[PDB]
Design a protein around this ligand. Structure first.
Ligand SMILES: Cc1ncc(COP(=O)(O)O)c(CN[C@@H](C)C(=O)O)c1O
Ligand SMILES: Cc1ncc(COP(=O)(O)O)c(CN[C@@H](C)C(=O)O)c1O
Lengths: 382, 382
C-alpha cells in the first residue's frame, strides 16, 4: 500500500506489545487475556493490533458486532472471537460456522435462533448480566434460568461463559464499583453451573484489582497505551506506552501583511508581518473544527492554528520562513515538546477513547515493529 | 454487499440528481458544473454521487488529493477530475497517465516536476490564485508569470485553467466577497492569455450570483441538499432536497426502577419507573459523545438520549414498552417529526458540512434511485 498525500498516522506495535506483555506478567497464570479490538482496534488497525496482542500473551479477541469479527477471519485471524454486542438470530449459523462466540441476554432471541439453527456446528454463547451499567444484559433470575434452559435444551447451543461490565471502574471512589461486583457475585448463584469462562474486568478494573478478575479480562484502552482516566493515572501498576501519533507536512508557505485575513469567515487577521503555513489535514480526517484554537508542533516548537479549520486543510502561524515539506506533528513529540491524545481530548472536551476512532479512513496507518516500518495501510489505497 | 448490524445510513440519489439538475437549468448553456466529491462525497459515497451528478448535468469532478481521484478511476469513472489540493512533483507522471488535472501555486514545484517528467502524456494544470482566503494559491504577479513561463516552456505541461476560492460567499454581507471578486479580476490581467477554464464559485456564490461564475462552477454542499449557511437559506433560488438520513433499531428494551443508573459514570438516574432502550450506534460510528443530551425519533416521537454515549451503543428513554427491532431514526423523518443535519450540527456546535463526514466507515450506506434500493455499500463488508 502507498499513499499520495503528506498526512499519515503512525502506530508503534512494540508499545502495544509491551502494554499487553506487562499485563500478562501482572495476571495469574490461569487468567486469560481477551484483547478488545473493536472499532478497527480503537482506530489503530484491527488485524495488526490483534496479531501483536496474541503474540504478547492474549489468547482471544473481542469486537463490537458481527461484521468486525468476519473481517478479522477474512484477514486470517484464527483465534477465538467474541462479539460483545447484539446480533440477529438469523445470523447464528454464520457465527457458528466461522467460530465466533456471541453475547446473549434475552430468552426471546434464543427462542428465535433455536427455530432457525440445527447444527452441525456448535454456537458458543456468553451470557451478559446487567449489574448496574444499564446497557445490555439480563436483570432477573426468571429470565436467566429461562436462557440457560433453552441453551441446555439445544444440542448445538453451548454456554461458554458469562460476564458483566462496570460503569465506574475508572473512578477513584469504588462505591458503585463495589456494588456492581457484589451484585455480580449474587447473580452468579442463579446459574445451575458455573461456565468455564467468567469475566467482568476492563482495563481499569484489571489493572487496579488483578485478583478480582476471575478467569478472563477484557483488555482495551490500556493496550493502546492510554489511561482509562486521568484520575487513576497515578494508580497504574506499570507505565503505559502510547502507540498512536499523527503527522503531516507543510505544502505551502507564505508571508502575510498586517490586515490580511485567513480562512472561512475571515475570522483571523494578521496583526503584523507573519509567516503562514498550510497543511493537508482537516475535519474530514478527524481533525475537527473545534480544534481551531489548538496548536501543532513544527521544528520542535508549538505553532498555533489560525482561522477556521477546513475539510481537508488548515493554517498555522510559523516561527519564521520554513521550507515546504517541513514535518508537522499533530499528536506525538518533536524535540522537547510533545502533544498527547489526552491533550487533544482536553481541548475537544471529550475522553481519549474518542480521539483515535475519529481519525478517519482517509488517513493511512504506518506500522512499526522492532524499530522498523512493517507495513502501510491505506483504506482508500489502490 | 450486506451488513450484520441494525445501523445504516440511507442516501437518496434522486435528491442529489434534482439538486444538480435545478442548477443546470439555472446556469448558462456554456457554464460547466464541476461536482465536488472529495471526502467520499461529503460522506455520501464517492462513485455513487459522482455518477448521479454526471447524469444530471455535471461534466467534471473535483477531489481533495490524488488518492481520492485514483479511487474514482479504479471504480470506473472516466470523466475529468481535478485535484484541488497539493500533490508531490514526483507524482505528476501518475496523474498525467490517469488523466487527472492538478492544482499548482508555486514555481518551485513546477521546477521540480519539469526535471522529473518528460512526456508522453500531457499534464493539465489549474492555476490557483489566493484572493483573500489565505489557504492555497499565488499572491504576486512575479510568481504568477514565472509559473506560466515554466508551463509554456515544457512541451507536456498545459495550463487548462485558473481559479480562486471565496472565504465569505455564504454571509449576507458581501463586502469581503466583493473585495475577493475584484481582486480576482485584477490578478487575471497578469496572465498573457486567458485559460479555457476560469472558475471561482462554490455553492453559495453560484446560487447567489450565477451571472458572475465565468465558465465553470464548483458545486459542493448544495448538491447534497444542505444550505451553505442558515443566513442565505432564504436567498436560495430553488428548494434543496436533503439526501442523507441515518437509522438504527432497538436491540434491547427494559424497565428501570427509580434510583437505577445508566451508562458510564452513572451520570443518569431513573427518577421513576421508565422504559429504556438500547441502540447499536456510538461514537466510533460518528455519533459523538457531545450528543448526549440530544434526542432521536422512535415510533414518530422524540426520545431523549440518556447517560453517556458509548463507543458502539447508547441508550434512550422510550414512551412505553416498544418491541425490540423497532426502528429509530437519528437523522431523517418519522411521521410528523424530522431531524435534519442542521439540527445535529447546532447541538454539536459545528456546521452541517462536518456531520456527514464524521459518520464513519463502520456505517453502511444504502442507496436509493427511482424510489427503489439501488445498492448497499459496506466499507468493512466481506
Ligand atoms: C463489554 C465491554 N468489555 C470491554 C470493554 C473495554 O473497555 P476498556 O477499553 O476501558 O478497557 C468495553 C467498553 N469499551 C468502551 C470504548 C465503550 O463501549 O464505550 C466493553 O463494552
Ligand atoms: C477549492 C474549493 N472549491 C469548491 C469547494 C466546495 O464548497 P461548497 O461545498 O461550499 O460548495 C471547496 C470547499 N469545501 C469545504 C468543505 C472546505 O474546504 O472546508 C473548495 O475547497
Amino acid at each position: 500500500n502507498d499513499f499520495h498525500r503528506d498526512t499519515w498516522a503512525e502506530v508503534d506495535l512494540d508499545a502495544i506489545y509491551d502494554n499487553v506483555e506487562n499485563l500478562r506478567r501482572l495476571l495469574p497464570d490461569d487468567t486469560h487475556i481477551m484483547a478488545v479490538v473493536k472499532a478497527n482496534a480503537y482506530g489503530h488497525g484491527d488485524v495488526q493490533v490483534a496479531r501483536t496482542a496474541l503474540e504478547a500473551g492474549a489468547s482471544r479477541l473481542a469486537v463490537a458486532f458481527l461484521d468486525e469479527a468476519l473481517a478479522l477471519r477474512e484477514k486470517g485471524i484464527e483465534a477465538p472471537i467474541l462479539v460483545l454486542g447484539a446480533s440477529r438470530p438469523a445470523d447464528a449459523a454464520l457465527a457458528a460456522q466461522q467460530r465466533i462466540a456471541l453475547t446473549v441476554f434475552r430468552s426471546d432471541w434464543l427462542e428465535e435462533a433455536s427455530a432457525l439453527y440445527s447444527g452441525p456446528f456448535p454456537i458458543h454463547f456468553h451470557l451478559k448480566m446487567d449489574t448496574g451499567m444499564g446497557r445490555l444484559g439480563v436483570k432477573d433470575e426468571e429470565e436467566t434460568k429461562r436462557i440457560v434452559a433453552l441453551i441446555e435444551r439445544h444440542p448445538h447451543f453451548v454456554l461458554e461463559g458469562l460476564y458483566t461490565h462496570f460503569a465506574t471502574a475508572d473512578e477513584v471512589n469504588t462505591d458503585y464499583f463495589s456494588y456492581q461486583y457484589t451484585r455480580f457475585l449474587h447473580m452468579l448463584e442463579w446459574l445451575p453451573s458455573r461456565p468455564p469462562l467468567v469475566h467482568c474486568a476492563n482495563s481499569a478494573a484489571s489493572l487496579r484489582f488483578p485478583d478480582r478478575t476471575f478467569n478472563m479480562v477484557r483488555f482495551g484502552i490500556a493496550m493502546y497505551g492510554l489511561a482509562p482516566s486521568p484520575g487513576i493515572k497515578p494508580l497504574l501498576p506499570y507505565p503505559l506506552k502510547e502507540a498512536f501519533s499523527l503527522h503531516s507536512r507543510l505544502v505551502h508557505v507564505k508571508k502575510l501583511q498586517p490586515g490580511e485575513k485567513v480562512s472561512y469567515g475571515a475570522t483571523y487577521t494578521a496583526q503584523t508581518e507573519e509567516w503562514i503555513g498550510t497543511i493537508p489535514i482537516g475535519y474530514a480526517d478527524g481533525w475537527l473544527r473545534r480544534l481551531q484554537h489548538f496548536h501543532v508542533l513544527v521544528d520542535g516548537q508549538k505553532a498555533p492554528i489560525v482561522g477556521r479549520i477546513c475539510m481537508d486543510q488548515c493554517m498555522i502561524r510559523l516561527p519564521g520562513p520554513l521550507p515546504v515539506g517541513t514535518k508537522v506533528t499533530l499528536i506525538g513529540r518533536q524535540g522537547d515538546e510533545v502533544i498527547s491524545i489526552d491533550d487533544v481530548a482536553r481541548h475537544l472536551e471529550t475522553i481519549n477513547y474518542e480521539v483515535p476512532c475519529t481519525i478517519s479512513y482517509r488517513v493511512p496507518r504506518i506500522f512499526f515493529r522492532h524499530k522498523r516500518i512493517m507495513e502501510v495501510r491505506n483504506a482508500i489505497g489502490r
